[PDB]
Design a protein around this ligand. Sequence first.
Ligand SMILES: C[C@@H](C(=O)N1CCOCC1)N1CC[C@H](NS(=O)(=O)c2cc3cc(Cl)ccc3[nH]2)C1=O
Lengths: 52, 229
Amino acid sequence: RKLCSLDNGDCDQFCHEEQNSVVCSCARGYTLADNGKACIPTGPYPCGKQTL
Amino acid sequence: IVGGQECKDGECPWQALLINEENEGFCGGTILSEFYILTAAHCLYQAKRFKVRVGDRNTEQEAVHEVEVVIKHNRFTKETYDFDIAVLRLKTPITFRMNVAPACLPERDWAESTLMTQKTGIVSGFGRTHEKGRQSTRLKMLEVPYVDRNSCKLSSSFIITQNMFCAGYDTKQEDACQGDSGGPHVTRFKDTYFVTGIVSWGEGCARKGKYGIYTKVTAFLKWIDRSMK
Ligand SMILES: C[C@@H](C(=O)N1CCOCC1)N1CC[C@H](NS(=O)(=O)c2cc3cc(Cl)ccc3[nH]2)C1=O
């Protein structure tokens, strides 16, 4: 296991491999955090989150 | 849903219910955005006119949205249930709140390599709780293991296309059932739930040697994206 195969490349959501390097991305309604790995909701009720 | 557990407050907020003229639920749907619902193409023949209900976990204790556009896959076949998918555009937008929120649409390759390879997904609906029974008044959910493609085709009396996948239990008596069709199959990844299937069909409900058959959402991500534009 390497890159996206190793714990999803440390990405919160989408992981792609570009030029043998991890590139993380997020679903609509999230912004990629400064660390380039976490996904931050842009509003209340972001997709895929239980409303607990 | 046969077996499984009741959806508790806020646990299945993406669930939608298609209700007939008599305001009785007959199929499920998944909330994709404020204006769009994902459902099964075959559900569109179970009522002449229908509306969509969101946010209710209990059909006995009390928002209803009318449908503006029905986008049905042109290749749906009544004979095999292949291409069993439709997108609904609502007349008024959904207000997100407790028990009302969209599921995420994943990117296709990542879904295939990371979500479809997880051990389980979750199916939910207001369908029957036994093969012979009335519709559930409570929303239920069930964790269903992804089923190996070969094991699935071997268990099935009907053709499993690449637009379908199997989930469920071989012996344990838990499955989706009538009335659950069109509803969500979601897969959790790091506390985020992504739509991965649409409840489509099964040979009975919770029959030994049979699994639930679901529309493979990854096969239709571009189609969905196009429909929402
Ligand atoms: C086998 C299938 C059927 O007739 N098909 C139509 C032609 O294409 C193949 C499937 N069928 C017969 C009983 C069953 N009806 S059902 O009880 O409403 C139902 C839907 C459904 C979905 C899932 Cl995922 C599991 C069980 C289940 N049971 C169903 O869909």
